[PDB]
Amino acid sequence: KGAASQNWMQTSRINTAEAARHRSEGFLLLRAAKPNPAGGPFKNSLYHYPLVWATLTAYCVGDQARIADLLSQC
């Protein structure tokens, strides 16, 4: 690691304003009165994963030319 790992936060949510508008206009076929952010189709979710600056080094037994060619497209 060239620097300390950073805890990256990401969420996921469906805009309830747009969902309500679509439900009103008939675009969305939903009968439920309210969204449920704790669970269901309109659930908000909070998750984290770490981000690192790193130099990846690994050792292998194989063909240099073909491995380098494969890694060229990565």
Partner RNA sequence: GUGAGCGGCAUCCAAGUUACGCAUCAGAUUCGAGACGCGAGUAUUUCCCGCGCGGG
Eight-state DSSP code of residue 42: T
Return residues touching RNA (CB under 7 A).
9-15, 18, 44-47, 74
Longest dimension (CA), the chain: 62
What minimum distance in Å lies between the beta carbon of 55 and RNA?
Answer: 16
Output 47 or 65, the one with its CB closest to RNA.
47
Q: In the complex, what is the shortest distance from the CB of residue 10 to RNA, in angstroms, rounded to a whole number?
A: 4
β-pairing verdict for 6-12 and 45-51: antiparallel
CB of 12 to RNA, least distance (A): 3
- CB atoms closer than 10 angstroms to residue 25: 8
